[PDB]
Symmetry: D2
Subunit: 351 residues, 4 copies
């Protein structure tokens, strides 16, 4: 019974292994996997075997940005059936705790989440999942778009928490994959202009393709100088800044750059301690907000994709079959591409 | 000193008259008028000499959707100067009352407002206005777009109060000018799909041009049937309904149509008493909200226009010089067009 | 095996019957019932065998405002154990649907809810319930206070949706049980003054005891006159009105009474069609909101009770043992009391 | 013409000087000052002649927490008249800028603000002020309560921005005057429990008198230990933390202490750079918000005082006549009291 699976055993130890075919409980579905995007999260576990307090204490299956086809459903599942194409939302609450009740299930301490240990991910042939967290895709939304909902959702959640809306000018720090999905989400939510900063001329070219209104190549500027160049291009201070690099200097830039009364959202992972002009922000009522994944983004993402109101397709720079997963991870690490997409279906390998 | 002015003396009594050149106080500007759109508000005062409790007790200058050029500024005015092209926000608070302080100046009982009596409007050659409520237009935004900010703002304010955002499906009742600006605002704010209903095949054709995702021609349907047809086209109940007709049956339709937990916003003017399945809405937590003009929409409208993120141009169906204002009002009443635009500048009559 | 249960068989057909001892599933608990309040909801099913579209098609156990003691827990239950005193939140979602995910589980169409048919209630000796919807009571919170969380929650949810906060003046229409819990919730949320209207001098005396800052006895006033008398007592128009009678004239009064920009919340059940100065509200941006039960109120209610920050005790006017349930229902119908409280525990019959 | 005035000429240079009687413009009033509280702001200008970028470049009158009696009004003033007792809101916008329009006038860069240079304050006999920012006091609200609205408003604004509401448990860092007003505001807004931390047994005794549910004396605890002790007393992590010391370790404590999804509001002034577990907060969606004074707090503060729903009286520990202002400032600096209150009226020196 063939179920090739990509597994991290520890720092730098990545292996392709055969796994049993999972058996779906009464409210789960079994999925034949199709398209699985990888991101810095996966690469980080690969390299270091941990992300902060999340530690790989036993071999873990990677992969958490995914779509596939229902092949089997549990006795209690009614909204999905074999043949259904679905996007997988990787975080599924185990308990109806208070976070779940108030509608912030992302914060639930007992949540299951693909490829954050000890929870196995979906970079494999066959995978089972809580049925309520698999979302039927319409026929004009590709498997890859379905997989891309996950990174898009990072941007949606951050932009919601920032309060991005009609006419706002927005600064996005970083033209990596995180920055690009926040650019996409901001424009989708009505931002008039997004400026994107980055050190790389290459990444910024790609941010342009994706829809950045302005690009700004940073070199040795101070945070105040960055904020200043940003304001100069926009004609004003941006109501919202989304910081996607985790780099302290970029966080400071965001604080100086953001319009008074505005919001800076931290999406990139920084060091355990950050040094910031906390006062500068606080005295200007610039709020500083973080994000932890996302909640309630799949249906609205699917709605925007299905209506062609957002375009995530240019994000995919590489495709590899599942058998070439180790190479794909090398490609993702070298960071020349954006989204490296893994194709798990021997039957079909198109988008 | 030539300052032709369109004046309503009472029910059906419209005249073009010469007025003195207004003198701007210390915080006012004098404007050479350029483009002035007319709407049902103006036509209503023309026909009936009142809109509810607002009564024309002495001759009134009409016109409240306008743009022009600063020719003179007061001693305290610093952000505008002669030569500046500006959009005029017709509601300017006279006092720093509590509504103003909390940021809801539209509700200020002593607000000045063009062409709502006893306040004279701007359908004339020369007009003076509170400087803080004239907004500089950038050079890639036409005078007509500047004039159109006013009707667009009706839609922006309504859609904000409805909470329209990323991915929502929205029902707009009415394909008249009010309905079309709400269609535009909803899409600009991130709605995935807007369906527009109306009795007229002609108006709906125009709603399509403007960007309606679906159109629905109504005839003798009951409110439940309308709600049903709407749901059928969208694939779900719309999170937001914007009611733009003021027609009781359309209001009821909105109540049946709107998703539970959603919002129905009333923009059209109905009868003094309305009969509604108030309970049906209330038990489904469908909120019912109204609007009174707008507040804080000019800068964000200008930002969206300047970035080409919204297109109001297709709204203009007719242009008349100021001298043909009576004809223009006839055209606006017969309701075959959408926006009838009046050109007040003898120097320039382009958009 | 003794499990006396109060059952409605149809219009005016109420019986006390022995039921099997329910068996808790893996995530349920079995409760030895202690205190069960009754309300117009129960009385309504008794009298008419329906509330609108909710119809008693087979015998139903009544009772939905309750507390008791855990005697048995399911294999998956960890936060509760035998001996735990708990308040029962009667609405427990069956499915993780979209309403649940976004934190509005009250709107879930498949929710289980005590004594709304076809779901049996908890007016009995032994009752089983979803464990996540039973809330441990601290030792300084009585069983009756625990039972009273349910009616209090009606007020909490309504006042939240109204946006009651520090310093607001609030109008509550109706001094029945619904009105009194909204008075309590408004004061708890920081309202400076609550005025309560009613036809009964008796009910208003009780509203005073409970904490009403002003009482207003209505007789033949018109809605405009009511609004006027209200404003006169408060010194201003109330930012919030909570309408608790369902009476059309009282709804109209609320519309005239509420401050511009304010909110009217409809808690009382009215007729299928209501006639209202919808326009008057809409043009003053008075929002009209309804409620459907409550969501996420139990923990904050328990917190306020435990800190003695709210006092629901004066609401209980009568106590009857379970065996005298038919009499208790007669008492509740005659409407001279407020909260009629039923004592189900043969071991203990104190508050 | 006697108008004694307290003036800072520079670091440690405080003088009492006679000033001209100010002349109120058309929308100003002249006030006979009555009660003026002092705070760290005043003391800071006294000691250092600056607070960050706000620098005393010429002699400045101090005092910004004040009340008095209207003696003269401008030609345009209608809501106030000689004899009116009023509370003075020290920040009065000069321009109708965008911050003002959207209801955040506190952020207006051109705002006038008592005793923040170059704007003279109200520690004097006679003072003139923008009429719209003087608020009539009812007869059951004392002059001192009127003066205390200003510090209370600091707490109101911070607690609003934190989202303090019914049932929340709140941590307040610091039992100085800033901490105590935030304790008062939180309880007024419906917090079930407030715990207050501080190094001083004396300050905490006073926080108890004022209404703190718990007090915690800190010594050499680490931020994690503080957060831990806080959680232990409350029985849970507080939904809101208000940090009132500006001390980096206390800010870190707030981050560890605050419930996930919660809010930490920074009210105390810290160093230009702060080192914080920014990541810890961000990954738990603990928002970090600052405050800059307040907006729209006077009317709701007056409403709460007039209804006896909040008690600021215990804050006043000392009273000095204006002639003993230098001593009063010494008393305020030695920090043994809380609110030092200055009495400016030779006619009356009661509360
Ligand atoms: Zn990822
Ligand atoms: Zn108009
Ligand atoms: Zn009930
Ligand atoms: Zn102060």
């Amino acid at each position: 019974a063939e179920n090739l699976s990509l597994v991290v055993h520890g720092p730098g130890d990545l292996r392709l292994e055969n796994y049993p075919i999972p058996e779906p409980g009464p409210n789960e579905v079994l999925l034949k996997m199709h398209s699985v995007g990888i991101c810095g999260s996966d690469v980080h576990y690969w390299q270091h075997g941990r992300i902060g307090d999340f530690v790989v204490k036993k071999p873990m299956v990677l992969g958490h940005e995914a779509s596939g086809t229902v092949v089997k459903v549990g006795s209690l599942v009614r909204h999905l059936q074999p043949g259904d194409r679905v996007a997988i939302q990787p975080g599924a609450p185990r308990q109806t705790d208070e976070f779940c009740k108030i509608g912030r299930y992302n914060l639930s301490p007992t949540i299951f989440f693909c490829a954050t240990p000890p929870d196995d991910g979906n970079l494999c042939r066959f995978y089972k999942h809580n049925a309520n967290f698999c979302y039927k895709l319409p026929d004009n939304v590709t498997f890859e778009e379905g997989a891309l909902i996950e990174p898009l959702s990072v941007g949606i959640h951050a932009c919601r928490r920032a309060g991005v809306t009609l006419g706002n000018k927005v600064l996005v720090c970083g033209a990596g994959p995180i920055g690009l999905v926040n650019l996409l989400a901001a424009k989708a939510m009505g931002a008039a202009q997004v400026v994107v900063t980055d050190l790389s001329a290459s990444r910024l070219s790609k941010a342009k393709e994706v829809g950045a209104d302005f690009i700004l190549e940073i070199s040795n500027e101070s945070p105040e100088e960055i904020a200043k160049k940003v304001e100069g291009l926009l004609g004003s201070k941006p109501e919202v800044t989304i910081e996607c690099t985790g780099v302290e200097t970029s966080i400071q830039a965001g604080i100086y750059a953001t319009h008074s009364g505005g919001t800076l959202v931290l999406v990139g992972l920084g060091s355990e301690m950050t040094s910031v002009p906390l006062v500068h922000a606080a005295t200007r009522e610039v709020d500083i907000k973080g994000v932890f994944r996302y909640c309630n983004t799949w249906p609205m993402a699917i709605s925007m994709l299905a209506s062609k109101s957002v375009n995530v397709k240019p994000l995919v720079t590489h495709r590899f079959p599942l058998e070439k997963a180790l190479e794909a991870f090398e490609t993702s690490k070298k960071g020349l591409g954006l989204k490296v997409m893994i194709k798990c279906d021997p039957s079909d390998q198109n988008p």
